Assembly symmetry: C6
Homo-oligomer: 203 residues x 6
């Protein structure tokens, strides 16, 4: 389907959890979301995960120019991809809400489509206490109508490291998508009209 038709499945302010595995080729959905987007794209890049998506798409033969043109907010890492507009540090595997808000202030083209890559990395690295703060990190932004956030997370990484943390994560978001071989399953949604349905937006 058309890019903007897909976004119509969500409301401004939502936090969407996109669960995928290593065989899912999640970078394809990320490309679909960024390519020819009608709204401004802002990527929160955790631990150089955007660079990984980028290189995989580049090798696949995609035109990565669109990925290079979006604005990015790095949280750790040393490989800059896209228009970096901010660089936050990660202490105790969590960012500074103070610094983060000071960075988005330079944005004024709201609303924006906000993909967040690499959250599962932070979770794998920390203990229960630090994992809980990472989730608080996510729930702290749910509802801010400045954007629609898409948290791409490798489901298995989180499940196997700490199953309780995955459950907390699915609880605080408003919608949950799961990339499977036959398409994208809408596990949870604000619109009961689409809950449990499977869509194939890339067709």
């Amino acid at each position: 389907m058309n890019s903007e038709k897909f976004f119509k499945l969500f409301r401004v302010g939502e936090t969407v959890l996109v669960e995928y595995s290593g065989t899912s080729r999640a970078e394809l959905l990320l490309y679909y979301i960024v390519n020819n987007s009608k709204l401004p794209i802002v990527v929160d890049d955790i631990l150089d995960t955007y660079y990984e998506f980028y290189t995989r798409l580049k090798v696949a033969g995609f035109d990565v120019a669109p990925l290079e043109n979006v604005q990015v907010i790095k949280m750790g890492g040393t490989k800059d991809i896209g228009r970096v507009i901010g660089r936050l540090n990660i202490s105790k595997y969590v960012i500074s809400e103070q610094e983060y808000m000071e960075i988005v202030s330079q944005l004024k083209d709201y609303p924006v489509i906000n993909p967040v890559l690499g959250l599962h990395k932070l979770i794998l690295l920390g203990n229960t206490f630090e994992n809980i703060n990472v989730v608080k990190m996510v729930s702290n932004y749910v509802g801010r109508e400045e954007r629609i956030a898409f948290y791409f997370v490798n489901r298995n990484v989180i499940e196997k490291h700490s199953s309780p943390i995955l459950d907390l994560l699915e609880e605080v978001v408003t919608s949950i998508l799961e990339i499977t071989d036959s398409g994208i399953i809408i596990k949870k949604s604000i619109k009961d009209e689409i809950a449990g349905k499977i869509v194939s937006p890339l067709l």
Copy 2:
């Protein structure tokens, strides 16, 4: 069913465990209880869990005025939602029974519906000794006629952290409801007849 009928399933003094998961959208049931209750609402908000429920409902388009109008006793956390009448500290992942009673003594309109949110968070953070004190906290109030308590807990979070603790919790409460896709199961009840039955008060 009627909201007046749903509440009839319980009697004053009961402690009801409401088990849910990340895909349950448990906030819908909380909203239902808050918006259809004819008694005063007193929420025990553990670690800003109420703010998360409120935020999810708000984004979902619900009129959340009823939520801001209830009385709230905060245990930890920093996000105020509703009329906060007390703030307790989470020392050793538990709360003082003395300081709590000191706060609830300022209430006169009894009985009340008392939703408790975030207990699983407390449990997830503590060890077995601390978890036991949390369970003891819950059993110490079972039977007090000034209210009917609804403990909303993310079942998976507790079961994966300490399965024994989840079973202790289920033992000490008088009723147990579990939210599923088909509806709400009454897993345990004072009424020996309803056990195992499923109801859909929100349809």
Copy 3:
């Protein structure tokens, strides 16, 4: 069946393990055993577990006078229910054998029905060596004709905390009953005539 016929399933000196879960509402079987008992009742109350049973029954509308009139030996705890004839301190999660006998001497008119509540708590809290001491505490009393003991234990609490202890426990007792939704399963018994059979004495 009327309680006194239920008691005929056992022989004086027996130690009966009553296995239940949080959804069993085991307090119902306890009430049945205590109410109108023709044999004296002596309750060993571990860590205020008797108060929890009492409280759930009271809220359920039972006439709990019978529970307040039986003799009780408390092991730890601060909630007094019934005629407390003794208070024993808990050290390393077991009770002094000397102190216990020192207390049971002030008793006459044997045999007695001896409900023991809360053993699973001692196991959940103690270390592996203390868990073994708990089982040892239980086996020390098997065979004494002055009573028939009923150890009410939350099966899941023990098995999910330390499966080996449950096995040791089941081995030292003479009879094992398991409360299920369909009735009480007699998992083990001295009488090969009832082993594997299910009875419903509460009807």
Copy 4:
């Protein structure tokens, strides 16, 4: 089946592992072997396990005189049952072989039936290194024609504590019996073909 027939399944020098569970009432088999023995009986009583078996049989109504007349070597424990001809301390959850032999040197009527009770307790108490020493002790006696040893072990206790240890144990013994609800299964035997067969000697 009669005593002599059952014993013909084994030859002198053999070490037989008798696996059971809490619900098996293994004391019935021990009674069968003791009461029906033309050979002298010598029991290795580890951590008062003989006393436990004794007590269960007594409460069951069995005539425990035959158990009181066997010679016993105690390893730890404080409950004396039978004619104690020796007492040994358990160092690091193992037994000194030089001290054990110094005790059995007083026996002048060979061969004997040697039941060994409570081995799973020594294992539940030790770590891998200490557990390996226990199996070592067991394999050092295999083959000695002065007796036929029957090691009664609670299978689940060992398996849950250390599965590798159970596998090693089964490897060093010459015969393995497992008590089930339908009868005793011969999991391993020097006699080919009877492996996998089930017998009911207590019928």
Copy 5:
């Protein structure tokens, strides 16, 4: 099935994860790749793993001269096989990518087929933090058109040591092959069509 058609499944710059187990005889596939590659072969030999593949093929009766003539970069280990053009010390279970780059600067006949052997050894040895740096090492080269890398990893070793790590690895590579008894499963590929298909190039 084929010879030159095999390499056509991949594009220059790809990173191929080849998953196998102890019963796969994965060396057969390595032999095939080395012996049928028209491009230069450069092997990254981690902890003398090339020597193990080599000895196994030699014993199987294969002509291993082709294995001895490829260029090799040893990462740890003391068993030289092939033509060692560089050696790297292992520190914190990873190597200096900077020194590695210097070592490969001598290569001037690009592209090359780059088999990497023994990665699961570095993973089995390190902790989570170190395992992440190993995966990081792998993702850093994804897309470099100088070669096509085939990482031979014992799947069970990684999965059983750190399941989260296996999922991270599968995520960062562009293609994944899994050796099975029925043939090679293409679990992931830049070509949508072939994903899920099985090929038997060794026929």
Copy 6:
């Protein structure tokens, strides 16, 4: 089939993993390999495991003279069974490869059937790092044509202690045999013709 045919399933230089369990009575297969053998037999006895196999066979009624007259290289242990031609020290649950070669230097007959007993014990006793060294110890001798080694290992003991280690072990060997009640399964082999097949060599 007699040993002669059985050994023909393998070729010199191979390392064969023989997986068994406590109910397998693996000693019977060992007896079959030793009793039956035109080639010289050399047993690597780790932590007195040979004594245990010997004792079980003895109580079973077998003639154990053939086991008493073979050459043995002890790796730890206290029970002397067979003709001990060497004693090796076990440090960090592994054996020095420089000392081993010195002990087999006295061996004039090649090739020899080399049953290695008790490896799972070294693994059960060590951590992951020491286990990996044990595996290296096995892979370092894969391919030496002076013998055909048969490592008798209690699979469950290794599997339950460290599943990864078992997979690593199965990887470095050239053939894998698994003893079951219906016979010996050939889980892996250099000879594709026999792979996956089940044989019952103990049948006369």
